[PDB]
Amino acid sequence: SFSQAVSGLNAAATNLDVIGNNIANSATYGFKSGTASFADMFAGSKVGLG
Amino acid sequence: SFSQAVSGLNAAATNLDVIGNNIANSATYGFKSGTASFADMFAGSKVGLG
Amino acid sequence: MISSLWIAKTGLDAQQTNMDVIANNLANVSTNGFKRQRAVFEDLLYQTIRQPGAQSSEQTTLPSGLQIGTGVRPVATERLHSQGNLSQTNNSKDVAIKGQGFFQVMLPDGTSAYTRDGSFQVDQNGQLVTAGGFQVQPAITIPANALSITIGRDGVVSVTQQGQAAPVQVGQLNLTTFMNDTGLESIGENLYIETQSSGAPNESTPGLNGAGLLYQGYVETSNVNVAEELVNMIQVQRAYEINSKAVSTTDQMLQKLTQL
Amino acid sequence: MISSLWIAKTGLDAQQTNMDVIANNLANVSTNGFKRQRAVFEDLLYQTIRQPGAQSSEQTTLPSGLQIGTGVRPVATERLHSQGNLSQTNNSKDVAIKGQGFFQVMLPDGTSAYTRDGSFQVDQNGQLVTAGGFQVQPAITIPANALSITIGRDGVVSVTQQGQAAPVQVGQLNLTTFMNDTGLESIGENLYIETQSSGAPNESTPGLNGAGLLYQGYVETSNVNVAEELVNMIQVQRAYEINSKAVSTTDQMLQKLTQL
Amino acid sequence: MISSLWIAKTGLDAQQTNMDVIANNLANVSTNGFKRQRAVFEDLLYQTIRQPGAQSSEQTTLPSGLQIGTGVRPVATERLHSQGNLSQTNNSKDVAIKGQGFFQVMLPDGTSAYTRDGSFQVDQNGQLVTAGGFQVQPAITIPANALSITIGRDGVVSVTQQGQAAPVQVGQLNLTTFMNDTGLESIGENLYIETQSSGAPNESTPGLNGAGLLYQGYVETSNVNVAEELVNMIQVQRAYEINSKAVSTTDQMLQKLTQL
Amino acid sequence: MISSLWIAKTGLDAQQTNMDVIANNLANVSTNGFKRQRAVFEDLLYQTIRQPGAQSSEQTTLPSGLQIGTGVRPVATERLHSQGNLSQTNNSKDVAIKGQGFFQ
Amino acid sequence: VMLPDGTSAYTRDGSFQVDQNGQLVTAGGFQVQPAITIPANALSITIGRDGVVSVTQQGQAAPVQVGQLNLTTFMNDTGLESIGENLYIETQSSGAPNESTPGLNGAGLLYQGYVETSNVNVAEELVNMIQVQRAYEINSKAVSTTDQMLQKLTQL
Amino acid sequence: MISSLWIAKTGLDAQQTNMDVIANNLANVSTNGFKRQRAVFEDLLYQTIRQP
Amino acid sequence: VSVTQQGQAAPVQVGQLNLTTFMNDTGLESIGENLYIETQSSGAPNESTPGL
Amino acid sequence: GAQSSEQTTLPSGLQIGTGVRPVATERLHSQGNLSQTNNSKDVAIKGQGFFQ
Amino acid sequence: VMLPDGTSAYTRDGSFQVDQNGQLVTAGGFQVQPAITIPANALSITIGRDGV
């Protein structure tokens, strides 16, 4: 729960960095916006890893 | 590990001193702003000094 | 004096090392061209007692014998060599690297150190020097009558004199790359020297076989991430407190025994 | 000199061994690729005196006769080989295992050891080694001018050179699986060696018949559950208290016999 | 009058010596340039009784005969001559060493002592003295109306005068290095004198021959690490308690002898 | 009454002196032209026992003998004579120093 | 370790010091075998896994090998004679001292920065003191009983 | 009881005097012909453990 | 009795520790130096592999 | 110091001592820290004098 | 050790002192041969492993 929560914290930070990069490039000719895709990291099926 | 953090606190205080001095001279003819540069104090690697 | 006490006395020291690394990283959050550290740990001795796999009978083996272990030791603190974010502080004397190369600087004793800090100054004689006063190599002199300094993406330093429409080339800045960037020995003042684990210094031009690119008016900031250091402090503090609790439990156990 | 004192001494030694195991587990919390250990005890000999089941009388037998037991002894310490939670260190050379495989390294002596920790570095010559400088086999040679190292899910190590849109394969990282994973002899330094109780090392590709998947930029932290360790510390302290009280009670009884 | 009493008395004395060293280390937390101490212990004599290796039979030997040992005694006290953490005192008169050098000062008796403490003052005559008033060597004298004192990384002391655009040199702060730094005899007042076990005084400038670099405005704090001292206090207390229990057991044995 | 107790007693006294220095520095924040104090300590005497460098055998010397030390003592309290921040009170009689002089 | 008289002793206490002429010696001043001389220009001394001692001097980017730490292995360890100050001398029960590199021929490894502590188990010794004391109190009572029996016999 | 405690109590009282002066200055903003106060402090006694 | 040799993932068998069993163990002759010798009331020393 | 022999002297002879006694109770006449009681009548001395 | 009559005796009591003319003597005052004479400006006397 301190490694499953850290993973979610880092994922949210990555998403926010992507959003900030999209905002900063509002006026940039030829720029394409970016989005982040997340996937779970299950192991056994009863033990989630974040 | 107390001196290492005290040094960082002092560096942040110096940065804020420079920022405050720059702000106070917003309207002062012939004023050139200041900038503080920092360098680490590694002793023999594998340990930090601040 | 007792085994668990030594083991928990190694746990305390390892967690103190982790806190030292975290605090040193947080203290240098603003120094340009900084690479943050990461401490790695490994298991100490493992007392054999009953040997694992020992032949108890003539046909039955003993699986996973009584392997009582000792505490922990740290192998080393390794530098996480990643590209710090570049900052546009718009000065002609600040240069930032985009790849994985290093600037070569000549130490006063005649040896050469390697630095990724790009905040360069000009001494009274006109040479490019590091902010600590160490002269850069292979020496780039700047005339007194200089109007503008232009350092291109290939490291060519040009100076435009008065009333002349063409720039004058005053040198060529080269980047040193190593087989192993982690093995370099940090000597402070944002300086690293060569060690035998870092191979040999391969000098290269900025854009060819693997030296990085130089951007003028840019400074390379540190790669330290504050939030991760905060979370790591919260976890190191808890681990240190729990190991101290183990020390206290051992102390209490030794009390009753002696009292008997 | 008296039986109860030997029994209580054995109990005290067993509880001290349990505390030593707990302290070793708590000292290796920050170690990557560490597995927590648990000790299992067995009761000692049983004095026969009156053989149960003997004829108590011509037509009747003795039900559950007089057996006097000795103390306790530890059988073995078993590891818990389970997947620890993954941690993102954002490093191109850190590798974590999702399944049940091990990395193979060569000791300087020429023998082969096995480690689950994936914190890898590169030496001065280019080969992938562990933190202790041991060379990962099968030898993976990273060339001088590498820009990025990609390690896939199936163990292929590729290097992307400058100006070439295709990546150059420079090795193949395999995983070794053993029938009995807990039977390996731990030599410390995060290293396990094969014993006769750990079967034979079966090499396999990471993704095939049961080797795990390799994740780049991830490290497998220890599986030590700390709250369980605190509760077990409480339990061990109380058990040591009770055994010491038994020793003290036996001491008080022998005193009255001396006084006689 | 009984062997065990003398042995346990020696043990008590050794533990008291360990506690004395611990208290000395703890009392000097705020001392600049202080080095922590460690005690080394050895076995005392060994009563031979049976000779191990003697001829028991015509073709058999006596393996590991009856050797009875005496108590314990401290061998020696060793310092940990390592770099202490630096502290910024923002004073132009305070100098810190980054390597392994010593400052040479002159005692009032005319003999030279060596100190790593950098808290310097200027006397009424202008000579750079230490906090106790001993004159550094050489007499780095200071002019009358100095505005600022600049001590470089290589020991060059310069003074900036008024109306003069160039700093004047008033001395050269040198460092003394020894073959064995642990062999220097401590005399108090943060002063070490030469002995025959500390080699010879090698005078050198800061930066060459290994001697360290000088930082102006910083002081070298003590290297005492508190957590080790606390765990060692626990160790000393419990070992002292065990040895006192052994003394008490010997006392009860002797008393039982007296009653008969 | 025992050596370690005296050493710890000296350490306590030194730390108390440091606390007094800090308290004095704090009490004079609003004073004009005040220079803060800093205390410097020194390590006390050493009980010799075995002499470091004493010739044990005919040829081998004893390195780093049993130098059991006593506590600590404060040498001095030094002022930091540095130019404090100047404050404008706009008064015709208040004077401030820019360098390193003193009024008599 | 080489003793002043020239005969070699053996120790497991790994706390070493450099003497005034370089030279690694034990804390008692006896020189360790074989010879390692550390120069003045040394910045850091590293002792490897296999006992190789390397010294880093200023300027040189490559460490300079100085000496080799050779471990002496006996085949009967307990048969050694404890000569006092953390030293054992060979006897007829522990003959043939085999010099070897650490890690080879069954020899152990070297960890630098760590010292092996005593293996004395404390609870065992306390329980043994209890047993010894009560045993000395039951033998003393046997002495007293024999004395009383003799006094009664010789009184008539 | 302790020198540090007396020094800190004295510093507290001095800062309280400064606060009272500031409050009295603020309370008399609208008064005609008022002159605001300013407090001047000084160092107290200095014990000579070792004479400079 | 098996020993571990360096580099050999397998133990080397050295010997078997056999136990001698007597019929009337109480009839043995205690000769002093923690040794019993066979006496006509404790005859027939049967060597055996322990456990069998 | 007595002549133990015809040519030698006795060093440090047999002195058996009795217990311990208190000599004197001395006062430490130093300057205590000042406390301000906001009283027009309380006076404090700064040097080394006494009121009569 | 040298007896008053001039013949040499032998002792194992290692408690020695020094008399007023330098010189090491026993607790009884008899002088020890060989003759070892400690000077007056001595700061510390070390007796080594080999009797130096």
Residue numbers in the entry:
A (entry chain ZG), B (entry chain ZF): 2 to 51
C (entry chain ZA), D (entry chain 5), E (entry chain 4): 1 to 260
F (entry chain 9): 1 to 104
G (entry chain z): 105 to 260
H (entry chain ZE): 1 to 52
I (entry chain u): 157 to 208
J (entry chain 3): 53 to 104
K (entry chain t): 105 to 156
Question: What is the paper's account of this structure, in its own sentences?
Answer:
The bacterial flagellar motor is a huge bidirectional rotary nanomachine that drives rotation of the flagellum for bacterial motility. The cytoplasmic C ring of the flagellar motor functions as the switch complex for the rotational direction switching from counterclockwise to clockwise. The basal body is made up of the LP ring, MS ring, C ring, rod and export apparatus. Here, we present two high-resolution cryo-electron microscopy structures of the C ring-containing flagellar basal body–hook complex from Salmonella Typhimurium, which are in the default counterclockwise state and in a constitutively active CheY mutant-induced clockwise state, respectively.
To obtain the C ring-containing basal body–hook complex in the CW state, we constructed the constitutively active double mutant D13K/Y106W of CheY (hereafter referred to as CheY**), which can mimic CheY-P to tightly bind to the C ring and lock the rotational direction of the motor in the CW state. The C ring-containing basal body–hook complex in the CW state was obtained by incubating the recombinant CheY** protein with the above purified basal body–hook complex in the CCW state. The density maps of the LP ring, MS ring, rod, hook, and export apparatus in the CW state were locally reconstructed to the higher resolutions ranging from 2.8 Å to 3.8 Å. Although the structures of the LP ring, MS ring, rod, hook, and export apparatus in the CW state are highly similar to those of these components in the CCW state, the protomers of the C ring in the CW state notably undergo inclination and compaction, suggesting that the binding of CheY** induces significant conformational changes of the C ring for rotational switching. The hook functions as a joint that connects the motor to the filament, which acts as a propeller to propel bacteria for swimming in liquid medium and swarming on solid surface.
